[PDB]
Amino acid sequence: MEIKRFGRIREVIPLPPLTEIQVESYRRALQADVPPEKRENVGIQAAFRETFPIEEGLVLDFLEYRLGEPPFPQDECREKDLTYQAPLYARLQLIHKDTGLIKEDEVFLGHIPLMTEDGSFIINGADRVIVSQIHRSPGVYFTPDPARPGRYIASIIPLPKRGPWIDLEVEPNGVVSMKVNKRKFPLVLLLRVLGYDQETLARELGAYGELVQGLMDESVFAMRPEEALIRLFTLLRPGDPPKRDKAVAYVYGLIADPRRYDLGEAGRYKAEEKLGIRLSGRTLARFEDGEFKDEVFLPTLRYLFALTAGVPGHEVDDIDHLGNRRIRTVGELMTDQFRVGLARLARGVRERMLMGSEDSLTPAKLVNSRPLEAAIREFFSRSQLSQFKDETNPLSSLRHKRRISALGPGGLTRERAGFDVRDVHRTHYGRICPVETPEGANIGLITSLAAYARVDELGFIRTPYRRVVGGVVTDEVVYMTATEEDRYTIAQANTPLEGNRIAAERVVARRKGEPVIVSPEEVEFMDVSPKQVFSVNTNLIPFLEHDDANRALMGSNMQTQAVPLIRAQAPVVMTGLEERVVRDSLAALYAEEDGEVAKVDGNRIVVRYEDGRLVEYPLRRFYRSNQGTALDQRPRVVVGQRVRKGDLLADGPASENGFLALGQNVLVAIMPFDGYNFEDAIVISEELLKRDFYTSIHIERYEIEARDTKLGPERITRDIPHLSEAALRDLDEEGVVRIGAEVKPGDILVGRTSFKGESEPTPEERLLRSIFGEKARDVKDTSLRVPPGEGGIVVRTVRLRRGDPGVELKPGVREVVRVYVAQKRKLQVGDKLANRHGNKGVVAKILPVEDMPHLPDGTPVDVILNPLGVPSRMNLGQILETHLGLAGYFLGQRYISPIFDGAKEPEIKELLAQAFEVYFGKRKGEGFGVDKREVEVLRRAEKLGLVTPGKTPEEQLKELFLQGKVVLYDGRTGEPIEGPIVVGQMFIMKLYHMVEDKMHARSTGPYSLITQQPLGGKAQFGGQRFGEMEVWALEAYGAAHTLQEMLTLKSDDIEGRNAAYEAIIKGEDVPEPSVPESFRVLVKELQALALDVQTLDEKDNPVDIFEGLASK
Amino acid sequence: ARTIRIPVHMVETINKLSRTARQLQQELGREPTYEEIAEAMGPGWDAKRVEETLKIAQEPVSLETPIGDEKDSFYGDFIPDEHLP
Amino acid sequence: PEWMILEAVPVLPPDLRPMVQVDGGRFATSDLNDLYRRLINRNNRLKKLLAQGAPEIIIRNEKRMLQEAVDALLDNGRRGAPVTNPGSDRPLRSLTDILSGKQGRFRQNLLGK
DNA sequence: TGCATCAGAGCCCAAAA
DNA sequence: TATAATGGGAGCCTCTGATGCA
Ligand SMILES: CC(=O)O[C@H]1[C@H](C)[C@H](O)[C@H](C)[C@@H](O)[C@@H]([C@H](C)OC(=O)C(C)(C)CC(=O)O)CC/C=C(/C)C(=O)Nc2cc(O)c3c4c(c(C)c(O)c3c2O)O[C@](C)(O/C=C/[C@H](O[C@H]2C[C@@H]3OCO[C@@H]3[C@@H](C)O2)[C@H]1C)C4=O
């Protein structure tokens, strides 16, 4: 079909590689493909250079590292619950400074996880994403002192964990104080340690009249730099003997040591630029020629005084400005943990270079890599920034990799965050999306990288702009940081152009984010596109300019939750980004070079290239994602087809011919329906199920271990005590359910026996067994069964024993069986649907086709959406989307309407007119005239001012069709709806929240160990939590016995809950409750605290709630 | 050092197994199997015995270990009670 | 008033600080057992140092270590550094922590279930 | 005696994991 | 059961009330 694209904006550059923030960060960090001599000092390399050489006369030096090849490919790691990783080795030379002896060896440091092609990791078999972390850039900032006006605080901030923060203040007493680790002292003392004299300080700061005297302290000047260093050490470190070598070591490590104190590389540049100096390194001072030599402090002190006096050119810094906030990407975070483990490894090395043999030592004997392996293993498994990959659909993972978190180690906590950080800063323009953020507690903490944004080497987000010189728009694009952007006047991307020339007398531009009207002579740059302001998810919302931001937010976020549908289609109204998302996602498969297709299968595609070489592409079929949606690729080409470089070969999941397909295009009527549409609920036609729209495949993994016990081995067997052949029917000889079997709740998946607890033969069971004459078996039935509410078709079984090639399990485990069960899920009542504009609702009613509202020519609608959802939400894009969708339904076409440069109303009306000709002119030739009911509707419509009175019925119907309204017949009555109704094609997705997953109920079940209260959650067969607020509700109702049940018979009252069950199965009423067991726990816990808790009667005599059991 | 106390001599064997396995991993460029450790340990050691030794050496984990979410759930809360009926 | 000083320290019933075998045959245990273990070890060492007539420096270090150990058991983190399990930053959960807070005994299991 | 400073006390629910 | 060895090592919000200060 035709695809008609609107908009006049020509984008000079395409979107960058969308996962480059991940892929490029880690590639730069490992530098695996660089030959060692050519590596720059960055990532792991920089870490090695930092840790080495490791001194005492033994000295160990670092030569170079190398990364091997992965022991197992990616697919294999996922299968075997392995980390996809490479062996890391380091060439080290041991030197004896006394002897000269040199032993050199390459020591094995363990493995490092490798990133896959799409920017994710495989850690213990599961796919994970490392989320970038936003934080305050290192540097020197000046903020106003909130308590005392006209005063300022100078804050020197290094990288997290790479040094202390310093605060410079001018105290009310007049002396300038320095704050380090919460202690204050006169800054003059520290200045004296650097070798400063009254002359130098007088000439430097003298310019500021009254302030320099606060620096002057006679007593401090009396002591020489040596005396001042010992004095300061005694101020900062009470008790510790102030040995001169000891003091230098401490202060050196605190200030001048590049190993213990690291400003960023971004920290260094920001300091150099702010104070107008050049730093020789990343430390606040140096140790040179035996003494301390200042670097930062005097320039920082100079700027602070100049600001307090109000000298022009000294400013406070906006700390939420995106010039002072930078991103720590995968490479930086991992390298940080690498550096920690490396420092720990050095402790072991130095400790081993004393207690060992001074003669026989290799580098292999000296180095223990366990600390290093643990730091990396800790980061990847347990870090907060290492997250279980979101792969519900391909857009999910692309979005996850492009996410920015302000949380995690070294960042904000969630309760400790006020408005300022969560705000949308003016500098977010083009860098962080203003729309895509969580609606809940995390709003503003979790954000998304903008579509055209890229992170530079220093970690600042940059966005592209086109240069405009004289008035001509060049094609040269400049990526700017927020700080540099503030210098220029930047015109909007839609400003009219004839050729490359600006065609308007007054243009809309920004100066430091402030919008201003300006002459073309004043225009320095221009936006690349509208797209650059928003995230990838937001850019997928057509007519976004017509949607209130609060609803666009939900629209963005919910596309992440879209389930891959077996019939999935791309939307009839696209934004033009839907091809790029699939291609960068790597879900879909494309041709490497030009060639001809040799073979096409469900499982594989063979392509013959220009070289003559025959390349085979295997296809991923029905694989289970982290969230249990089916990822499967389908071949879109045929044998003998000539393909070009980059032509589509196979469609990934949730893609249609290479376009992102998150849902279906359905025919919707906007109208109330008998209250089944009420309060965002949705009414749908049974026709959707009939043609398998909104049907999705889901796979669940079940697992069971057979292990060695002290009571004897668990065995996975088909021989299970007391089971009929009916119960075992679908189990094979070995006890595993057969592939292709249908399993329902209660069915056995894997048969397993466990040796009976050592108490086991109860005397009651002994007599019972004796009566029937069946020996009580030694083992009990522990078989894995289908949980309540689950089940499907068995598509896979994996069995792994001990002692079979290639497999070694965790200690004690004989064998592991995994069963993959698939289900085809038809849309049903309670499943959740949404569109891209933030309209979301649960399916409340499925009507038979004869009840569905229908057009005069007999076509029934698919979905009925209530109009009451539009006006309060103010998301009108869905309305425009429906109108253009109506034209396309009859014209047989789809559209690309870009965001903010889109199809406008007049253009949509033209298409609607051409459509009416097809919807109506066809009929007039077929020998049918206007309907009687169409006449009644036209009458009511002319009473509403929709149609012009006096025109023919055909003319009036067309007037309504240009308004997107049609005559609609109620399938129940046959009578029309008394008014014309908005009908068109809408793109609607079936989201990840499905009633099948959430429906849960419990009579009785598992209880917790200490509290004896029911466990939580559906997976444990838990009970619902009746919490503090629920009790209040029962209290306010005065329902004392209902509440008492919740607190006793229905929870941790053991005698009570036991007695209640027996009563109910006997038809008796439930008995009076007893003491809740968790109160007894409370009493004993208070006794453990040496508090005597006594229950008393009205006579103040003790009442024993333990019934004699705890008293002698 | 252990919540479950181990005889001093048995701790010596466990530590020997660690040193041995760590050496083996440093020459082999990967973690050794149970069988490779049994060779390195000399006579008397087969793969089964290396596994049994590792099982005894496992330290318990806290019931108070946090479970995802936020600071909202404990590991012990997900453990059913099999003793009380 | 002298009851505010402890001579005999109570020991909570074992099932309220359980040692249980989980699914894999692995053991999971309450933090209180480690807090008690620290206490017992230091107390026994104190008995031994006393019987062997150690200098006052040794006895004082031991006694102050003993107070801190009781402190960790009853309210950990209240005074001084919170006692943690090795290779974890997680403070061990003491009796005070069990009683109080959103996750404590009163609000979690008593005013709601 | 009237003012400052610091230690310690709190910071939504249910759901999930 | 014996060469001699002798002092550690690290860090990221508001209200209310007691405590220590002119
Ligand atoms: C076990 C696990 O993977 O869960 C992970 C991970 C979020 C998810 O699973 C999954 C990738 C999920 O993102 C998608 C999925 C569809 O989920 C959802 O739809 C819901 C609605 C449920 C999301 C929700 O409501 O939570 C949806 C994403 C959509 C949006 C708008 C989003 O941005 N959400 C989101 C939600 C969060 O809360 C955090 C978060 C955090 C950091 C640094 C983040 O950036 C977070 C984040 O971005 O610090 C905190 C205190 O704790 C962090 C706890 C957990 O991290 C593990 C990481 C390691 O795993 C084992 O040890 C480690 C330990 C640290 O816990 C979280 C981070 C924390 O709250």
Side-chain angles (χ1 to χ4, degrees), chain A residues 285-313:
Chain A
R286 291 173 308 176
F287 190 83
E288 175 178 281
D289 303 328
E291 61 177 13
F292 283 99
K293 290 172 175 293
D294 186 42
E295 283 271 50
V296 178
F297 293 94
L298 187 61
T300 294
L301 176 61
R302 197 271 317 159
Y303 198 109
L304 169 56
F305 278 174
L307 181 59
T308 300
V311 173

mmCIF file of all heavy atoms in Angstrom, chain A residues 285-313:
data_model
loop_
_atom_site.group_PDB
_atom_site.id
_atom_site.type_symbol
_atom_site.label_atom_id
_atom_site.label_comp_id
_atom_site.label_asym_id
_atom_site.label_seq_id
_atom_site.Cartn_x
_atom_site.Cartn_y
_atom_site.Cartn_z
ATOM 1 N N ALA A 285 46.943 19.687 45.149
ATOM 2 C CA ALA A 285 48.293 20.219 45.284
ATOM 3 C C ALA A 285 49.304 19.164 44.847
ATOM 4 O O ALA A 285 48.941 18.053 44.450
ATOM 5 C CB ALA A 285 48.560 20.670 46.723
ATOM 6 N N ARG A 286 50.586 19.526 44.925
ATOM 7 C CA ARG A 286 51.679 18.656 44.515
ATOM 8 C C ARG A 286 52.713 18.531 45.625
ATOM 9 O O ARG A 286 52.810 19.378 46.517
ATOM 10 C CB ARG A 286 52.387 19.158 43.248
ATOM 11 C CG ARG A 286 51.582 19.070 41.963
ATOM 12 C CD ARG A 286 52.347 19.753 40.844
ATOM 13 N NE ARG A 286 52.751 21.104 41.213
ATOM 14 C CZ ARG A 286 53.503 21.891 40.451
ATOM 15 N NH1 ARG A 286 53.944 21.461 39.277
ATOM 16 N NH2 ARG A 286 53.825 23.106 40.871
ATOM 17 N N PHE A 287 53.486 17.450 45.556
ATOM 18 C CA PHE A 287 54.706 17.277 46.339
ATOM 19 C C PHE A 287 55.907 17.362 45.405
ATOM 20 O O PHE A 287 56.163 16.436 44.627
ATOM 21 C CB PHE A 287 54.712 15.952 47.097
ATOM 22 C CG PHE A 287 55.826 15.842 48.097
ATOM 23 C CD1 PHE A 287 55.707 16.384 49.366
ATOM 24 C CD2 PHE A 287 57.012 15.208 47.751
ATOM 25 C CE1 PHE A 287 56.752 16.284 50.277
ATOM 26 C CE2 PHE A 287 58.059 15.105 48.655
ATOM 27 C CZ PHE A 287 57.930 15.643 49.920
ATOM 28 N N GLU A 288 56.646 18.465 45.481
ATOM 29 C CA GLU A 288 57.718 18.716 44.530
ATOM 30 C C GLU A 288 58.899 19.309 45.285
ATOM 31 O O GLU A 288 58.743 20.284 46.026
ATOM 32 C CB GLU A 288 57.262 19.660 43.407
ATOM 33 C CG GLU A 288 58.371 20.066 42.448
ATOM 34 C CD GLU A 288 57.880 20.952 41.324
ATOM 35 O OE1 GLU A 288 57.288 20.421 40.358
ATOM 36 O OE2 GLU A 288 58.089 22.180 41.406
ATOM 37 N N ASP A 289 60.074 18.717 45.076
ATOM 38 C CA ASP A 289 61.320 19.146 45.713
ATOM 39 C C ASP A 289 61.224 19.137 47.241
ATOM 40 O O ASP A 289 61.793 19.994 47.922
ATOM 41 C CB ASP A 289 61.754 20.520 45.199
ATOM 42 C CG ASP A 289 61.916 20.547 43.689
ATOM 43 O OD1 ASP A 289 62.295 19.503 43.118
ATOM 44 O OD2 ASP A 289 61.667 21.608 43.074
ATOM 45 N N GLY A 290 60.489 18.160 47.786
ATOM 46 C CA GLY A 290 60.415 17.935 49.217
ATOM 47 C C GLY A 290 59.315 18.657 49.973
ATOM 48 O O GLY A 290 58.991 18.246 51.094
ATOM 49 N N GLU A 291 58.723 19.700 49.404
ATOM 50 C CA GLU A 291 57.673 20.477 50.061
ATOM 51 C C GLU A 291 56.368 20.378 49.268
ATOM 52 O O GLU A 291 56.298 19.730 48.220
ATOM 53 C CB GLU A 291 58.133 21.925 50.266
ATOM 54 C CG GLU A 291 58.463 22.690 48.999
ATOM 55 C CD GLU A 291 58.843 24.130 49.284
ATOM 56 O OE1 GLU A 291 59.078 24.457 50.467
ATOM 57 O OE2 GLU A 291 58.917 24.930 48.329
ATOM 58 N N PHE A 292 55.322 21.030 49.779
ATOM 59 C CA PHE A 292 54.027 21.066 49.112
ATOM 60 C C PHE A 292 53.906 22.331 48.276
ATOM 61 O O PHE A 292 54.246 23.426 48.733
ATOM 62 C CB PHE A 292 52.885 21.016 50.128
ATOM 63 C CG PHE A 292 52.645 19.650 50.692
ATOM 64 C CD1 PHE A 292 53.154 19.305 51.935
ATOM 65 C CD2 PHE A 292 51.943 18.702 49.972
ATOM 66 C CE1 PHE A 292 52.945 18.045 52.459
ATOM 67 C CE2 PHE A 292 51.732 17.438 50.487
ATOM 68 C CZ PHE A 292 52.233 17.107 51.733
ATOM 69 N N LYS A 293 53.405 22.171 47.054
ATOM 70 C CA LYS A 293 53.221 23.278 46.127
ATOM 71 C C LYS A 293 51.753 23.346 45.719
ATOM 72 O O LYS A 293 51.197 22.367 45.209
ATOM 73 C CB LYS A 293 54.152 23.094 44.927
ATOM 74 C CG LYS A 293 55.617 23.316 45.325
ATOM 75 C CD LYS A 293 56.609 22.959 44.231
ATOM 76 C CE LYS A 293 58.033 23.321 44.647
ATOM 77 N NZ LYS A 293 58.253 24.786 44.775
ATOM 78 N N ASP A 294 51.136 24.501 45.951
ATOM 79 C CA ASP A 294 49.713 24.716 45.714
ATOM 80 C C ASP A 294 49.341 24.671 44.232
ATOM 81 O O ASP A 294 50.140 25.001 43.350
ATOM 82 C CB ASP A 294 49.265 26.049 46.308
ATOM 83 C CG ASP A 294 47.763 26.245 46.219
ATOM 84 O OD1 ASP A 294 47.026 25.270 46.477
ATOM 85 O OD2 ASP A 294 47.319 27.362 45.880
ATOM 86 N N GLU A 295 48.097 24.255 43.974
ATOM 87 C CA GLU A 295 47.507 24.192 42.640
ATOM 88 C C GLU A 295 46.171 24.929 42.612
ATOM 89 O O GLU A 295 46.003 25.898 41.863
ATOM 90 C CB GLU A 295 47.284 22.735 42.207
ATOM 91 C CG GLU A 295 48.506 21.949 41.750
ATOM 92 C CD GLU A 295 48.764 22.093 40.256
ATOM 93 O OE1 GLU A 295 48.786 23.234 39.753
ATOM 94 O OE2 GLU A 295 48.917 21.056 39.576
ATOM 95 N N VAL A 296 45.215 24.469 43.413
ATOM 96 C CA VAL A 296 43.841 24.969 43.356
ATOM 97 C C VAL A 296 43.581 26.109 44.341
ATOM 98 O O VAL A 296 43.106 27.181 43.956
ATOM 99 C CB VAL A 296 42.858 23.801 43.589
ATOM 100 C CG1 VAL A 296 41.437 24.310 43.590
ATOM 101 C CG2 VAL A 296 43.042 22.736 42.520
ATOM 102 N N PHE A 297 43.883 25.878 45.619
ATOM 103 C CA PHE A 297 43.445 26.754 46.710
ATOM 104 C C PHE A 297 43.623 28.255 46.458
ATOM 105 O O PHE A 297 42.697 29.037 46.701
ATOM 106 C CB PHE A 297 44.164 26.345 47.993
ATOM 107 C CG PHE A 297 43.752 24.995 48.499
ATOM 108 C CD1 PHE A 297 44.472 23.862 48.151
ATOM 109 C CD2 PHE A 297 42.617 24.851 49.283
ATOM 110 C CE1 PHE A 297 44.087 22.609 48.604
ATOM 111 C CE2 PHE A 297 42.225 23.600 49.737
ATOM 112 C CZ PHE A 297 42.961 22.478 49.398
ATOM 113 N N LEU A 298 44.797 28.695 46.003
ATOM 114 C CA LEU A 298 44.867 30.151 45.871
ATOM 115 C C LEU A 298 43.926 30.660 44.784
ATOM 116 O O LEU A 298 43.219 31.652 45.000
ATOM 117 C CB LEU A 298 46.289 30.642 45.599
ATOM 118 C CG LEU A 298 46.353 32.176 45.633
ATOM 119 C CD1 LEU A 298 45.954 32.700 47.009
ATOM 120 C CD2 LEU A 298 47.721 32.703 45.236
ATOM 121 N N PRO A 299 43.875 30.015 43.615
ATOM 122 C CA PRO A 299 42.879 30.433 42.615
ATOM 123 C C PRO A 299 41.447 30.329 43.109
ATOM 124 O O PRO A 299 40.621 31.187 42.769
ATOM 125 C CB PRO A 299 43.150 29.477 41.447
ATOM 126 C CG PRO A 299 44.609 29.205 41.547
ATOM 127 C CD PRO A 299 44.910 29.147 43.026
ATOM 128 N N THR A 300 41.124 29.304 43.906
ATOM 129 C CA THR A 300 39.763 29.187 44.419
ATOM 130 C C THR A 300 39.476 30.246 45.478
ATOM 131 O O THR A 300 38.371 30.801 45.524
ATOM 132 C CB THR A 300 39.532 27.786 44.988
ATOM 133 O OG1 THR A 300 39.582 26.818 43.930
ATOM 134 C CG2 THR A 300 38.179 27.713 45.678
ATOM 135 N N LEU A 301 40.457 30.535 46.338
ATOM 136 C CA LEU A 301 40.297 31.586 47.339
ATOM 137 C C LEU A 301 40.131 32.948 46.675
ATOM 138 O O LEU A 301 39.296 33.760 47.088
ATOM 139 C CB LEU A 301 41.494 31.591 48.294
ATOM 140 C CG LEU A 301 41.540 32.699 49.348
ATOM 141 C CD1 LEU A 301 40.321 32.610 50.267
ATOM 142 C CD2 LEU A 301 42.841 32.668 50.143
ATOM 143 N N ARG A 302 40.920 33.200 45.629
ATOM 144 C CA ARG A 302 40.851 34.450 44.879
ATOM 145 C C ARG A 302 39.473 34.678 44.268
ATOM 146 O O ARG A 302 38.914 35.779 44.360
ATOM 147 C CB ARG A 302 41.942 34.430 43.804
ATOM 148 C CG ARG A 302 42.302 35.760 43.186
ATOM 149 C CD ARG A 302 41.409 36.015 41.992
ATOM 150 N NE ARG A 302 41.266 34.798 41.196
ATOM 151 C CZ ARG A 302 40.273 34.573 40.342
ATOM 152 N NH1 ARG A 302 39.328 35.488 40.163
ATOM 153 N NH2 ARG A 302 40.224 33.433 39.667
ATOM 154 N N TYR A 303 38.898 33.645 43.656
ATOM 155 C CA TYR A 303 37.575 33.795 43.063
ATOM 156 C C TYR A 303 36.514 34.036 44.137
ATOM 157 O O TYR A 303 35.610 34.858 43.952
ATOM 158 C CB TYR A 303 37.258 32.537 42.253
ATOM 159 C CG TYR A 303 36.145 32.644 41.234
ATOM 160 C CD1 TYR A 303 36.442 32.633 39.877
ATOM 161 C CD2 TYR A 303 34.813 32.748 41.612
ATOM 162 C CE1 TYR A 303 35.451 32.715 38.923
ATOM 163 C CE2 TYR A 303 33.806 32.835 40.656
ATOM 164 C CZ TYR A 303 34.137 32.819 39.310
ATOM 165 O OH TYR A 303 33.160 32.906 38.343
ATOM 166 N N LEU A 304 36.605 33.323 45.262
ATOM 167 C CA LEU A 304 35.639 33.490 46.346
ATOM 168 C C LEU A 304 35.608 34.919 46.887
ATOM 169 O O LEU A 304 34.533 35.515 47.019
ATOM 170 C CB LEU A 304 35.929 32.495 47.469
ATOM 171 C CG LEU A 304 35.161 32.744 48.771
ATOM 172 C CD1 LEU A 304 33.660 32.762 48.514
ATOM 173 C CD2 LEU A 304 35.516 31.697 49.823
ATOM 174 N N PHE A 305 36.779 35.486 47.214
ATOM 175 C CA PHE A 305 36.819 36.867 47.702
ATOM 176 C C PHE A 305 36.297 37.846 46.664
ATOM 177 O O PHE A 305 35.532 38.761 46.992
ATOM 178 C CB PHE A 305 38.239 37.270 48.116
ATOM 179 C CG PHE A 305 38.636 36.821 49.497
ATOM 180 C CD1 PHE A 305 39.930 37.018 49.946
ATOM 181 C CD2 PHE A 305 37.713 36.249 50.358
ATOM 182 C CE1 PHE A 305 40.309 36.625 51.216
ATOM 183 C CE2 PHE A 305 38.084 35.850 51.633
ATOM 184 C CZ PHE A 305 39.385 36.040 52.061
ATOM 185 N N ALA A 306 36.702 37.678 45.410
ATOM 186 C CA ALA A 306 36.229 38.580 44.371
ATOM 187 C C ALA A 306 34.706 38.548 44.255
ATOM 188 O O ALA A 306 34.086 39.561 43.910
ATOM 189 C CB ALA A 306 36.899 38.224 43.048
ATOM 190 N N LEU A 307 34.090 37.396 44.524
ATOM 191 C CA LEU A 307 32.635 37.286 44.481
ATOM 192 C C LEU A 307 31.966 37.976 45.672
ATOM 193 O O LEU A 307 30.999 38.728 45.496
ATOM 194 C CB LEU A 307 32.242 35.808 44.434
ATOM 195 C CG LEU A 307 30.760 35.427 44.359
ATOM 196 C CD1 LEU A 307 30.079 36.019 43.127
ATOM 197 C CD2 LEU A 307 30.594 33.917 44.416
ATOM 198 N N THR A 308 32.467 37.742 46.890
ATOM 199 C CA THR A 308 31.868 38.367 48.073
ATOM 200 C C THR A 308 31.879 39.886 47.970
ATOM 201 O O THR A 308 30.901 40.551 48.335
ATOM 202 C CB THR A 308 32.584 37.909 49.343
ATOM 203 O OG1 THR A 308 32.485 36.484 49.457
ATOM 204 C CG2 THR A 308 31.949 38.557 50.572
ATOM 205 N N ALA A 309 32.970 40.453 47.459
ATOM 206 C CA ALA A 309 33.074 41.893 47.286
ATOM 207 C C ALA A 309 32.218 42.363 46.128
ATOM 208 O O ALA A 309 32.001 43.571 45.977
ATOM 209 C CB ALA A 309 34.529 42.307 47.063
ATOM 210 N N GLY A 310 31.734 41.428 45.316
ATOM 211 C CA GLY A 310 30.896 41.754 44.189
ATOM 212 C C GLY A 310 31.704 42.203 43.005
ATOM 213 O O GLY A 310 31.219 42.996 42.190
ATOM 214 N N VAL A 311 32.934 41.719 42.885
ATOM 215 C CA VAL A 311 33.719 42.115 41.720
ATOM 216 C C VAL A 311 33.096 41.491 40.478
ATOM 217 O O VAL A 311 32.815 40.280 40.463
ATOM 218 C CB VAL A 311 35.177 41.679 41.879
ATOM 219 C CG1 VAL A 311 35.948 41.946 40.588
ATOM 220 C CG2 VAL A 311 35.820 42.405 43.053
ATOM 221 N N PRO A 312 32.854 42.276 39.445
ATOM 222 C CA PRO A 312 32.275 41.752 38.208
ATOM 223 C C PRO A 312 33.095 40.625 37.602
ATOM 224 O O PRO A 312 34.328 40.660 37.590
ATOM 225 C CB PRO A 312 32.207 42.981 37.303
ATOM 226 C CG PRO A 312 32.100 44.104 38.265
ATOM 227 C CD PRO A 312 32.929 43.742 39.443
ATOM 228 N N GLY A 313 32.380 39.636 37.072
ATOM 229 C CA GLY A 313 32.955 38.469 36.429
ATOM 230 C C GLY A 313 33.029 37.230 37.263
ATOM 231 O O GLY A 313 33.605 36.232 36.815
#
